[PDB]
Design a protein around this nucleic acid. Structure first.
Lengths: 279, 268, 281
RNA sequence: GCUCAUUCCAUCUCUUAUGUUCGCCUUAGUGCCUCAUAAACUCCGGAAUGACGCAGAGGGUGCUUAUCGUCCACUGACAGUCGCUU
């Protein structure tokens, strides 16, 4: 069961028209009637498409989650939330229509949008997948809806940090590559040179140098930032290639600490120290 | 510390100079009146950061004896330096009465050119000319020098055989959606525009430029002869190209040497 | 004379404003530290010209009271009239990428967005003193300035002087009317023949008009609709603002409603130099 | 610059017939005049711009291609420590 909700003007309509091709485009139903409708569609035995908005929102989400309670299990619900900025929102809604709540309330075109946002927010908090429509025009919005809605693997997006070395060339599975050369070479110490990347003494040497911390952290800020956008798309293995030349001292420790951090954030992480692998 | 100061006829583009020094981290208070410099500089000692200023006919004193007197007043730690500028009279008009205003004003400015630590002829100048001139002028010259190479590759064809840093730009809005765009490539102003609108593009271009900028100095040390950043779309015609270009131009402005390479387009 | 202070959320077109003012003639000052400014005022007193200064995140102290006491030290009682620009996060970011340096709030500040958001509150103290709050959300790199030139070419002394005039269709319409509204469709107690010659301003007529509710709905909606023109009121460039409502003869109905609106905005506190001039003559 | 459809500033003014009912008069007058059905013109205290020419005045036009979006993994290179030898 597909759920298409969001601030008006964010383009629910075009999504529906494309949702009918994906599936059961049906709109403007009191959510209460939904579960029985699902009972009916069980005969249809084909995925569905239900649209809810400020006009179709009963302004009492207790009822909403009540309808969520008696949900036939045949269809698994997913909250798809279109959203965008106020100004654009007004622009598009300037298309011939009439914001229903604004009747009687007479909120300024900007003021009802403000009202509606919070109004529907209950769902939005529980909204499963979000998509901006900040600036995609209706024709641009049509192709963008087609690419993501087809989520075949709605399972996870595994991280995998591959620690490599340059002398044996960039790993072919690399999606990103962050050199690390200019960091303080542990080589300087002859004692540490035989010791491998995982051996605590080198971890100490690296720990001694704060610059290392600065790099890890700033790199954690760089990814996390550009991350969620990626996580939405239908990827199966996002990877980050980290490499000194040696691929035995620096890149080891880096990839290790990063893996730790992101595991902390709960994204499953896979370590791979290409050179240390038995090949 | 430093108290760089500026001069030259109007239209010489002193603002660019100010922009450059700001780029170096030199704080600027352009067009402050002459007299107030000393206590300001005291404040700036409390900033503990080298900075610079400008001067104009507007800031030009009637009696420069006061100028040099207070110029003495400034605390030692902030070393003052004076730059003067010159170009062709009409050359200045392109950036800009129109002969005599300048002539009398030049008499006003003449004491400075006499006092100028450096004088440049900016008649054929350019931002990059000025930026490099400045970098060597103040930061000094290192025979060690980078040459950033920005390559736009297509993940189909493969990651460049040589590449220090690479960035996937698959998530950013795809010009591909509009069919009238499919043929046109990254350097056709249609698509350039089309991206320019979608903010996310600007967001990324920034954050990336910031990441590099932060790790760029260390790399300068150790006399690296090249640093290559390669930016990849799937096909490498639309997104990666645009990003490579703009992202280059920023670093060009900061004056480091740069070289673009649209690997997919250069195939044919 | 006057010393204008220019400011706004980072990269909100501020630079353009300074371009504008220097084009006007206000002495140009960029990014001076807050402290010495009053001394500069003293200096300018010699020049006998207005001045222009910027204050934004760059020259923004952490302590609030700094610019407060600085404003206190202002000499010559020169009117310290502030100016302020603003636009939305997305607009700002799209505008802050002018090959410009970092938001000086790059002290491990997560993202341009995050730093710029906190900027607002950081900069909030300024918002208090605000002789204008013009927005640049709509303008372009070159077009924005055009709008800005328009701006500030005005006298506040010409404060809005709101008006309501009720008139009759029987002879015409006030020629200078800013807005115009027919209301005859509102209930007309012509049924009461005693009210028919009786002046509308009389309480019995007002009570008879009050007897109906459609009038109250109308006025509530109309008064609320007028309040959406507050930005238009800010862009006055006009000595007095007029409002046109006309009955057939004006005296029948329009008066009491104009009275109610006069009450509404006099209640809002607006200047109400109202006149139902066409009524008596 | 010259001179002008322009721009944004200019202080600037009135009407016939429609039927009707109530406020009032002429004493019929078809009215003085409230309500009320439609039809019907103008006009100078600022600051920008385009319109020619002053002044510079030395390739174009139409339509035939572009297949390149997602997603999944074989992977490469002759130019100090020591683990060594004969």
């Amino acid at each position: 069961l597909m759920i298409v909700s969001g601030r008006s003007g964010s383009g629910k309509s075009v999504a529906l028209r494309a949702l009918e091709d994906m599936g059961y485009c049906v709109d403007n139903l009191p959510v209460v009637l939904l579960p029985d409708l699902a009972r009916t569609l069980a005969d249809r035995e084909i995925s569905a498409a239900v649209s809810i908005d400020v006009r179709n929102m009963p302004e009492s989400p207790e009822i909403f989650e009540q309808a969520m309670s008696n949900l036939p299990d045949a269809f698994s619900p997913q909250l798809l939330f279109l959203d965008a900025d106020r100004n654009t929102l007004i622009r598009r809604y300037s298309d011939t229509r009439r914001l229903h709540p604004l009747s009687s309330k007479n909120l300024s075109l900007e003021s009802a949008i403000d009202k509606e946002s919070d109004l529907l927010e209950p769902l939005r908090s529980r909204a499963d997948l979000i998509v901006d429509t900040s600036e995609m025009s209706v024709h641009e919005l049509a192709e963008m809806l087609r690419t993501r809605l087809l989520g075949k693997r709605e399972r996870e997006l595994t991280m995998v940090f591959e620690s490599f070395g340059f002398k044996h060339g960039i790993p072919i599975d690399a999606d990103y590559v962050f050199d690390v050369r200019f960091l303080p070479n542990p080589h300087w110490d002859p004692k540490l040179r035989p010791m491998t990347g995982l051996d605590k003494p080198v971890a100490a040497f690296l720990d001694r140098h704060t610059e290392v911390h600065n790099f890890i952290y700033q790199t954690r800020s760089y990814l996390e930032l550009w991350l969620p956008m990626l996580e939405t798309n239908n990827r199966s293995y996002l990877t980050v290639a980290i490499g000194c030349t040696g691929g035995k001292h620096r890149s080891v420790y880096i990839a290790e600490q990063l893996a730790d951090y992101f595991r902390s954030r709960g994204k499953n992480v896979q370590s791979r120290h290409r050179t240390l692998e038995k090949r």
